Each structure stands twice: as C-alpha cells, then as structure tokens.
Ligand binder design. Structure first.
Ligand SMILES: CN(Cc1ccc2c(c1C(=O)O)OCO2)C(=O)N[C@H](C(=O)NCc1ccccc1)c1ccccc1
Ligand SMILES: CN(Cc1ccc2c(c1C(=O)O)OCO2)C(=O)N[C@H](C(=O)NCc1ccccc1)c1ccccc1
Lengths: 149, 149
C-alpha cells in the first residue's frame, strides 16, 4: 500500500496534464506535456521514483504499459508496472472527480499565472496542502514513516 | 529544521543544474535548466513547495534573493526567503562535496541516458536511495513525520 501509485492523464487548453496519485493518501505530482508519449511518461516516472518510494505503478493506458521506453524506465527505477484496470469500480470515479477538482483550481488561479504549467503546479500545491483534518501531504508522510519503522 | 531547504546551482556540459537540498536529511530534488533566471528559480520553488512542506529557503545567490519573480513565488507558496550565507562554514564544503558526488553519478550513467536531464534524474534517484544506516529519503520522511506528530 505505501508504494502504490496510479498514473492519470487529463486534458486542458489542448495540452496534456500527466498526474501520479499516491493511492493510499490522495497525494499527487503533475506536469504539463505537449503530448502523452512513452518517452514523456518514462521520464515522469523516473522523476517520481527518485522523489518517493515507488514500488508499483498502475499505468493509465495500454500504450504506456506496452511502451519499451516506459518498461525501460520502470526496470531502471525498480518499479513493478501493473495495469490500471479498476477491479474496484469506484476507482474511475475517484480519478474523474480529482481531474474535475484540479481543473477547477487551475481555473481559480488563472489571474495569477501567465503559463498553464505554473497554474498546474499551483493546483498541485493547493491539492496536497488542503485539509480534509489531515492533508494528503501529511497522510503520505505518515503512511511511509509507519512503513519504514 | 524540518522545513529548511537550501538552493544550489551547479554546472555541467555548458548547462545549469538547479538543486534543492533538505538541510536536515540530505534529500534532494534537481532539474536541468538552460540558464539560472529568476523565472526558472521561481517555478522550481513552486514545484518543490507543492511536493514537500517548505518553510524556509536559503537562496543560492543574491540575484535570486532579489528577483521579483522569486519573491512572488515565495509569497505565493508561503515560503520565507533567507540568504544562503554559510554563517556555519562547514555548510559550503558539504555543498561542494554534493555537487562532486552528483556529477560523478551523472558520469556513471552515460551509457544509459541519452539526455543530460535523464542522467540528472537518475542521479537524484541514486542519491536519495543511497544507504549511508538509513537513506536520505528515509531521513526526510522520519523528520517530517516526527514534526506532524
Ligand atoms: C509567481 N509568478 C508565477 C510564475 C513564476 C515563474 C514563472 C512563470 C510564472 C507565471 O506566472 O506563469 O512563468 C514561467 O516562470 C509570477 O510572478 N507571475 C508573473 C506575473 O506577472 N503574474 C501575473 C500575470 C498573470 C496573468 C498574465 C500575466 C501576468 C510572471 C513572471 C514571469 C513571467 C510571467 C509572469
Ligand atoms: C529509460 N531511458 C532513459 C530515457 C527515458 C525517457 C526519455 C529519455 C531517456 C534518455 O535516455 O535520455 O529521453 C527522453 O525521454 C531509455 O529507455 N533511454 C532510451 C535509450 O535508448 N537509452 C540508451 C542510450 C544511451 C546513450 C545514448 C543513446 C541511447 C531512449 C529513449 C528515448 C529517447 C532517447 C533514448
């Protein structure tokens, strides 16, 4: 549970937003890319796994699952690639709801940020710090700390 | 001390590597940029603070300390800007030693990474996972978890 992440790809302004969600906490990292290629996904996974203990990734689609570059990044970083099929069906709705929340925050910061990539990072910040009362950022730290001990 | 970070800018292959170090743990995040401008530094700080609880940043030089865009990012993200003067002089030798270790790791991965940005992320991964004994990644999580608790 502490090492399980889910990839999520959403679209806004004709651009692609790639998100990784730590399943157990709701914590996220995200980037804006021109298009979702194996190479972009592979590089994003390498970044993520150098930053948090990533054991398993539920990839967002079959193209990335199949991609030799994504497989190469997962081999390099010690990540088990798994499908992202929602065997528990409430998975898709949790993801769809987060995409909607993220796009709303992005819309709320549209004065403040000239570039979409800035607005996406502001939305990452607001999502991870939001008190739900613990934040997603507090939950991921406590889950992993409990794991290390 | 759990919220204290230090910025570090080092150079390789005519390119700029920007590093943030979590002072209490040695944990890092890093990126390759074309040039160290206020805007690049500002954006890097925004990303960092949405990912970890950043209370204070010891900026790497006076130009970023001064920059209106860096000040705007720090205001936005709730970060106190401080100078990065080694009042404690052992601070600056620790930074030089890290820069050397990073460039060494980067050299060791060049039969594996086509682009410098990839090699840099591989070096972040190896640095944060390296067992010193706990890893830097383990130390940051434990430091912050104790802070929450
Ligand atoms: C903290 N910050 C955001 C930021 C930080 C670093 C970056 C950015 C951005 C960004 O805004 O996308 O773009 C790449 O490097 C900032 O100071 N914004 C400046 C500004 O004038 N905003 C008002 C505004 C709102 C809407 C339109 C125009 C301006 C700004 C600073 C430099 C470049 C562009 C904008
Ligand atoms: C996991 N990985 C690294 C990686 C992942 C994602 C990326 C990358 C890189 C990168 O290497 O910089 O660049 C943009 O998106 C990978 O499979 N590399 C491919 C390869 O052939 N490397 C051997 C090699 C070593 C030395 C020279 C040439 C090749 C590769 C894949 C796509 C593009 C370029 C290289």
């Amino acid at each position: 549970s502490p090492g399980i992440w889910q990839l999520d790809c959403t679209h806004l302004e004709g651009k692609v937003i790639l998100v990784a969600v730590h399943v157990a906490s709701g914590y996220i990292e995200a980037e804006v890319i021109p298009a979702e290629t194996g190479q972009e996904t592979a590089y994003f996974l390498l970044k993520l796994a150098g930053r948090w203990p990533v054991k398993t990734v539920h990839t967002d689609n079959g193209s990335n699952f199949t991609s030799t570059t994504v497989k190469a990044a997962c081999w390099w970083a010690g990540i088990k690639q798994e499908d992202g099929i929602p065997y528990n069906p409430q998975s898709q709705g949790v993801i769809e709801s987060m995409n909607k929340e993220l796009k709303k925050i992005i819309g709320q910061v549209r004065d403040q940020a000239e570039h979409l990539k800035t607005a996406v990072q502001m939305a990452v910040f607001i999502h991870n710090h939001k008190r739900k009362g613990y934040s997603a950022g507090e939950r991921i730290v406590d889950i992993i700390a409990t794991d290390i001990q």
